[PDB]
């Protein structure tokens, strides 16, 4: 069931914008409320163009199928605001509102740019639950990073940004499209630039999760002082990245070791990763979520 952009309607009497909460080369994100019920939504606004059509449809088709999982921000619907002949129309994407912002932002606003280890373990576990849902449905995210992990005002964790995700049709199937964000890309995805035979699968998302854990621990991905072109040369050649400080637990160090195995056929699968002690053993979840929520509110 593929979306047909021509059938989308003007949102005239259904939602109203409230405040602008984000902006980038993609468009704008707004806080919005349903005018009839008052319920809260985020609304992403992009103007329409044939040139960005394929990614738009992939985002909407992926969200409609999978966003009902509690670790994926929920899709509510879409509209197209109709503007006069000289002016582009705009697509509105109506989503579950994630009021705490991104993990990248959380790190930026923290003293030393380093989260507490128990916070990192909780966030990583929530990301893996989302990945598990996706991988079991033959989906590869392909752009896992702190900018695409959001937090609600109650410290729930939600994955976003499905525009370059891959939908396979067989379990064993593989992909070869050279796509991602450089510092978080897996060595077997990078290899597709110069190697027209290379392939990757769902384990490339697990590499990116490893880089995102390092992002949370140290404030940036590895090689953040290299130009992107040099990072892309060094990721397949350097040994796998490690945490700089010996103060982290052996558990955390072991988990980073499991995500960042360079040989992807020897990298553990999502299910095995879910059983790692760093992820599996969190008996103080209630306390951790409270501390995260309070830290989030402290940082404004």
């Amino acid at each position: 069931d593929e979306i047909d952009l021509s059938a989308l309607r003007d949102p005239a009497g259904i939602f109203e914008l409230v405040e602008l909460v984000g902006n980038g080369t993609y468009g704008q994100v707004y806080k919005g409320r349903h005018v009839k019920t008052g319920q809260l939504a985020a609304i992403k606004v992009m103007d329409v163009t044939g040139d960005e059509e394929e990614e738009i449809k992939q985002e909407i088709n992926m969200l409609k199928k999978y966003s009902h999982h509690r670790n994926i921000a929920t899709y509510y619907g879409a509209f197209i605001k109709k503007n006069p002949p000289g002016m582009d129309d705009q697509l509105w994407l109506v989503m579950e509102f994630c009021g705490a912002g991104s993990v990248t932002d959380l790190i930026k606003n923290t003293k030393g740019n380093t989260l507490k280890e128990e916070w990192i373990a909780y966030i990583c576990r929530e990301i893996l639950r989302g990945l598990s849902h996706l991988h079991q449905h033959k989906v590869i995210h392909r752009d896992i990073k702190g900018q695409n992990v959001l937090l609600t005002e109650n410290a729930e964790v939600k994955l976003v940004d499905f525009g370059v995700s891959a939908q396979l049709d067989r379990t064993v199937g593989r992909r070869n499209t050279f796509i991602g964000t450089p510092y978080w890309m897996a060595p077997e995805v990078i290899a597709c630039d110069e190697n027209p035979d290379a392939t990757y699968d769902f384990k490339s998302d697990l590499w990116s999760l490893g880089i995102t854990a390092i992002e949370m621990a140290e404030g940036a991905p590895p090689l953040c002082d290299m130009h992107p072109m040099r990072a892309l040369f060094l990721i397949p050649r350097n040994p796998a990245p490690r945490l700089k400080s010996k103060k982290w637990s052996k558990k955390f160090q072991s988990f980073i070791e499991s995500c960042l195995v360079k040989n992807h056929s020897q990298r553990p699968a999502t299910e095995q990763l879910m059983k790692h002690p760093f992820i599996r053993d969190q008996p103080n979840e209630r306390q951790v979520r409270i501390q995260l929520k309070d830290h989030i509110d402290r940082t404004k």
Binding site: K145, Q147, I179, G180, T181, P182, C224, M226, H227, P228
Partner: peptide, 17 residues
Amino acid sequence: SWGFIYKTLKSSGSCSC
């Protein structure tokens, strides 16, 4: 990078140099 685009990849997201 922040803004660096290489072929079909997203923006660098982390850097420049």
